[PDB]
Amino acid sequence: RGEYVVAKLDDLVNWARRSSLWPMTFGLACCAVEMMHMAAPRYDMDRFGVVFRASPRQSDVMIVAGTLTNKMAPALRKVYDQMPEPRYVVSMGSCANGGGYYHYSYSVVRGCDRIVPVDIYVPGCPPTAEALLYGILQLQRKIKREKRLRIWYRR
Amino acid sequence: MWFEILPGIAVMAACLFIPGMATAHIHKFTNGGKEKRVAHFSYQWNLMERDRCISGVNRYHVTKGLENID
Amino acid sequence: TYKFVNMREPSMDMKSVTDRAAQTLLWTELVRGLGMTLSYLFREPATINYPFEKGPL
Amino acid sequence: MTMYIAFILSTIFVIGFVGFSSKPSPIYGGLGLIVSGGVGCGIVLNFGGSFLGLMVFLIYLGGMLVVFGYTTAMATEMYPEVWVSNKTVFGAFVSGLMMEFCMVYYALKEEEVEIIFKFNGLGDWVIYDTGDSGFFSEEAMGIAALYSYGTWLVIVTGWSLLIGVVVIMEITRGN
Amino acid sequence: AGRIASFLKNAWAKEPVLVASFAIGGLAIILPSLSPYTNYAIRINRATPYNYPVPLRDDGNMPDVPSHPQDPQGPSLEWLKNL
Amino acid sequence: MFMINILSLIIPILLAVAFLTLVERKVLGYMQLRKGPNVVGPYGLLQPIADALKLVTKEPLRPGTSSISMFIIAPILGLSLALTMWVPLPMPYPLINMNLGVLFMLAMSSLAVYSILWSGWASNSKYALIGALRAVAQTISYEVTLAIILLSVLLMNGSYTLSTLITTQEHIWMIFTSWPLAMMWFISTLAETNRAPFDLTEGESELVSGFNVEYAAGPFAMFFMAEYANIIMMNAFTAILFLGASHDPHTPELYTINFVLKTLALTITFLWIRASYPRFRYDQLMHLLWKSFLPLTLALCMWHISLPIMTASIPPQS
Amino acid sequence: MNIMLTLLTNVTLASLLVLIAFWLPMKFFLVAITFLLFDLEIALLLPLPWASQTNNLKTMLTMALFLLILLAASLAYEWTQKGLEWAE
Amino acid sequence: MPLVYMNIIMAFAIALAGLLMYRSHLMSSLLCLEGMMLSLFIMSTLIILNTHFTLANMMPIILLVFAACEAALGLSLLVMVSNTYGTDYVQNLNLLQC
Amino acid sequence: WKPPPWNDVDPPKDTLVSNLTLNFGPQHPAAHGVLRLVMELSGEMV
Numbered sequence A: 001r002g003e004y005v006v007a008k009l010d011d012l013v014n015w016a017r018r019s020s021l022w023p024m025t026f027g028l029a030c031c032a033v034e035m036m037h038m039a040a041p042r043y044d045m046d047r048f049g050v051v052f053r054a055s056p057r058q059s060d061v062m063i064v065a066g067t068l069t070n071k072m073a074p075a076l077r078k079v080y081d082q083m084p085e086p087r088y089v090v091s092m093g094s095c096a097n098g099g100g101y102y103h104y105s106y107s108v109v110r111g112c113d114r115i116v117p118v119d120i121y122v123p124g125c126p127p128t129a130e131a132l133l134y135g136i137l138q139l140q141r142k143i144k145r146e147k148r149l150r151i152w153y154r155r
Numbered sequence B: 001m002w003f004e005i006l007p008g009i010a011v012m013a014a015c016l017f018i019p020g021m022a023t024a025h026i027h028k029f030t031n032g033g034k035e036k037r038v039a040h041f042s043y044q045w046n047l048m049e050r051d052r053c054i055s056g057v058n059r060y061h062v063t064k065g066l067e068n069i070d
Numbered sequence C: 001t002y003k004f005v006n007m008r009e010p011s012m013d014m015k016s017v018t019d020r021a022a023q024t025l026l027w028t029e030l031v032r033g034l035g036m037t038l039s040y041l042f043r044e045p046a047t048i049n050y051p052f053e054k055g056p057l
Numbered sequence D: 001m002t003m004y005i006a007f008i009l010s011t012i013f014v015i016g017f018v019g020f021s022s023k024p025s026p027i028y029g030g031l032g033l034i035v036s037g038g039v040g041c042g043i044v045l046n047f048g049g050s051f052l053g054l055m056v057f058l059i060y061l062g063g064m065l066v067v068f069g070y071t072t073a074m075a076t077e078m079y080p081e082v083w084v085s086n087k088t089v090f091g092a093f094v095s096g097l098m099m100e101f102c103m104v105y106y107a108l109k110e111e112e113v114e115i116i117f118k119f120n121g122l123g124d125w126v127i128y129d130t131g132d133s134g135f136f137s138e139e140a141m142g143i144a145a146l147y148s149y150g151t152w153l154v155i156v157t158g159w160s161l162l163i164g165v166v167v168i169m170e171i172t173r174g175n
Numbered sequence E: 001a002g003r004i005a006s007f008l009k010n011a012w013a014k015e016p017v018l019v020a021s022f023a024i025g026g027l028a029i030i031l032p033s034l035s036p037y038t039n040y041a042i043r044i045n046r047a048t049p050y051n052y053p054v055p056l057r058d059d060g061n062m063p064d065v066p067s068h069p070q071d072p073q074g075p076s077l078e079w080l081k082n083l
Numbered sequence F: 001m002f003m004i005n006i007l008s009l010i011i012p013i014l015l016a017v018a019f020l021t022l023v024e025r026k027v028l029g030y031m032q033l034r035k036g037p038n039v040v041g042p043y044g045l046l047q048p049i050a051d052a053l054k055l056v057t058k059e060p061l062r063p064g065t066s067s068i069s070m071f072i073i074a075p076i077l078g079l080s081l082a083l084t085m086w087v088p089l090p091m092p093y094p095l096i097n098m099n100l101g102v103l104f105m106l107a108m109s110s111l112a113v114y115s116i117l118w119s120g121w122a123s124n125s126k127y128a129l130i131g132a133l134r135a136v137a138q139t140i141s142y143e144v145t146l147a148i149i150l151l152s153v154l155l156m157n158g159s160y161t162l163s164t165l166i167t168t169q170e171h172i173w174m175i176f177t178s179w180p181l182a183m184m185w186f187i188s189t190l191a192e193t194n195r196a197p198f199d200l201t202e203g204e205s206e207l208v209s210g211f212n213v214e215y216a217a218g219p220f221a222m223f224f225m226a227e228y229a230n231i232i233m234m235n236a237f238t239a240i241l242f243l244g245a246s247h248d249p250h251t252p253e254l255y256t257i258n259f260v261l262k263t264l265a266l267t268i269t270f271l272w273i274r275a276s277y278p279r280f281r282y283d284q285l286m287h288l289l290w291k292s293f294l295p296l297t298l299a300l301c302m303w304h305i306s307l308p309i310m311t312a313s314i315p316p317q318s
Numbered sequence G: 001m002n003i004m005l006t007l008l009t010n011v012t013l014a015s016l017l018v019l020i021a022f023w024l025p026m027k028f029f030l031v032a033i034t035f036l037l038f039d040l041e042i043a044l045l046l047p048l049p050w051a052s053q054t055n056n057l058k059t060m061l062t063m064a065l066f067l068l069i070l071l072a073a074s075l076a077y078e079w080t081q082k083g084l085e086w087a088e
Numbered sequence H: 001m002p003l004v005y006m007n008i009i010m011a012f013a014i015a016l017a018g019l020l021m022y023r024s025h026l027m028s029s030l031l032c033l034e035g036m037m038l039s040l041f042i043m044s045t046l047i048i049l050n051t052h053f054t055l056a057n058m059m060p061i062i063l064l065v066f067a068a069c070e071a072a073l074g075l076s077l078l079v080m081v082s083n084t085y086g087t088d089y090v091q092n093l094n095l096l097q098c
Numbered sequence I: 001w002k003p004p005p006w007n008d009v010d011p012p013k014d015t016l017v018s019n020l021t022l023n024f025g026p027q028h029p030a031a032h033g034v035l036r037l038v039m040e041l042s043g044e045m046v
Ligand SMILES: CCCCCCCCCCCCCCCCCC(=O)OC[C@H](COP(=O)([O-])OCC[N+](C)(C)C)OC(=O)CCCCCCCCCCCCCCCCC
Pocket: C024, C025, C026, C027, C030, C031, C034, E014, E015, E016, E017, E020, E024, F179, F180, F181, F182, F183, F184, F186, F187, F197, F242, F273, F277, F287, F288, F291, F292, F293, F296, F303
């Protein structure tokens, strides 16, 4: 059936994208170091897709780790547009989520939502290294429940 | 452990196996259970046309020996 | 108390220059670096199998 | 077809020359010569001359022309003209097209082209000789005489290259 | 003498690649001169019949040239056989 | 007939190139004490498929400063070159028995540098342009030693026929006769193939991606696969040159087993060598090349030309 | 023919899989010029293998080694007068 | 005479016209001068290989190794007029009016 | 047409330098993160 055909194609594309993200590091503060332990063998992430290819052009998901500043605001943003789609951003830690410990400050924008469309939020100050692995995994399952080719078929 | 890279290695050996057997077996099939007669110099070339033209079926690989002449 | 670090002196004798010349031509400290990584290849990994394995707290 | 393959390649060789003779952007002009260099070896290859042909790939196409476009890369203006750009460049290209079309048409119908050199218009293959070469490649055994008969050639070409190395520094020294 | 030996020793101390290059190039230029197999290399080089041994018109008075290919007269490469 | 052999050669080569990404992330990790790609696919057998599929489904970006004409020929000029370079490889009986195969392999190896040169010009960015400029200059500087090493090695072998390699290297590996040139050759392979300590462009942080600075998924598949493609072969060329196997005419299976294992082991060392050494600074590349590698190679060519004359050991070209 | 067929098939495969990826989704000069001169001098001794089998290889020995020392001589003059120590 | 040689002979002529006519850039002129010796190389090899003039195989290799020496000189001069004038445009090279 | 310079030295033009001021920092993990660097260089020499 036609819906089966578009379902198999949807699974094939979704399974590929969710399983082989190529995140680009945008660590700015202590939120960078603890994600950078996910690189350490204890919570290896290269076990599933996410690898060292880096090269923000060759990146699917962006992890914004640390406090976001007003002078950092445009340069981070222009990175996001240059990042080709499907682009998703991961909000790392209380500071990148909603400003955290510097919410009432003049050189920080409260949260990354004011700048980029945040798809996933990982609480912590800093979030434990494995907790981000869960956040990546839940983002992986978020891609699994995507119906790009299905929604096109309805149209 | 360390042997978890072996199945990653083994599949490669299967992939690189294909060119080795193919270009050898295809040679055997296109030469009739033989190998492609190399022609690195003129002698090795007109030798083939000598054999290709005498065979009658215009194939160098098929060879007629003592049973042909009297 | 204190201690220098880069105060080693290179010996100019026939023996010492031979090892250094051998090291430069026949790369040995590079091979020593190779041996360090290779010995670690046969070392078991410490990759916690998330989510099934979870880090200690 | 396949009989005219040397003619076919020779035709691409001529139009390849119009590519860089029209003087386009130096990178694009180099590319037009790169293909022209590539096909020219095939013309040599079809006549034999494997080693002589292979150099055109190696020491000229992958050689002289690599540093050629390399110089154009770090030199030249910030606005490189795209092949169309100046109407003269396309005018030169179409100009090169009409020369090769008129002769080739004249070549394949009347076969009596007399432009400068009188040349009769037959296929490429009616010029090859006949005979077996034994067990030695004629091209390979010819340039291998560089060290058995190429006595005065090696002495002079070697000396000039050493002077070539010294002249390039002296000009590039900047006094 | 003493300075020359010290010159070589410090050359090997800091510049071991070049002294290796000069030594190898230094040798590679002089053994081929006094080599005892160089003449052998030439001898086997001419003893490779690329071109056919065209026969000669038998007018007599020449015993060195064999009448038959298997005849003992004429050159032989028995030396090439054992070496 | 002929065409079925063409796919039977290039297609398994291409599918092996995709998989090499897995081991690059895995055997490094098993040395880095990591695990390598394991979760996706059994034992990470499916990660290269996941890697390759998004690159052929992600959006292909063409920067406005990039000439689309130059943006498309270069990836084809690179990948196709790697595949046609495989045609004279002496797999038992080679697909192409070019008597000048050694020159044939080297000639289009020089053709490879046009792939990076045009891409650096096509990208048209200040940092990108200089990154390619001081990348091509590296590769060309390493070809002169490449040619000299080749010239010395086949001088003792014979003619340039790649099939003759298995004949000269009958009883002893050729490395036992030119081991000072073998490491001279091996490091030269490490530099043309653009791998650490000469990763340079493709360095994940050296030039972030070098030839892939602005060049992302889509056409970037034919520009990050080609470099890995030359890795398997240029090591395999070393395998034929110095580690030649035996070939029984009645059983070409033995040489297929031996050569593939030898070239696969060499590629392991090639992947071993990235995970054990830093990256040469630009000046250090030329300092290593012109002033230490270049003079030594000349001296060894001095030695290897006289030695057959020294011992009456000239090889038969026919 | 076979050679042309091989290269033609490679181009189409590169072209085909490119299309699916596009529609379905003084120092710098000196290193160049020094390589150019060395590369040209390299092409001189490429015919060496067959030249090693000439019938007067003694004259070959003097002159094949001649080009190689000139390769060294060209580098030696380059090295001593700065040269390979590129402008920095 | 075979049309492949006339194809080469014009190839010199179109290269000759490009070298003489000039448009803007000395890079293109140096490129045009290289097509000169290029078309000379195939023409030389074609005649020499056809006639089995064994010793004459000398000249093709000798031809371009000396033609490349023009590139060694020609390329160097360009960068100097590029260093001083800026762009290497021929129009800039007019100081020696007198 | 002005007379040629007596010393035969034509007058130098102004500077023709290409000292691009590279912007290191907020794109490269090479800068370890937020390390915007402003510096000019002679192609390679800072
Ligand atoms: C009768 C005998 C005739 C022949 C005799 C020949 C001479 C004796 C033998 C000499 C040694 C062999 C030839 C020279 C080799 C070294 C060349 C050189 O420049 O060395 C110094 C060079 C440069 O050392 P450097 O830069 O520290 O010092 C050089 C000298 N100055 C400072 C003055 C410039 O060392 C290297 O290049 C190091 C290696 C760089 C690449 C990194 C990866 C290395 C991987 C090593 C392990 C794997 C090996 C695989 C081997 C192949 C396997 C198939």
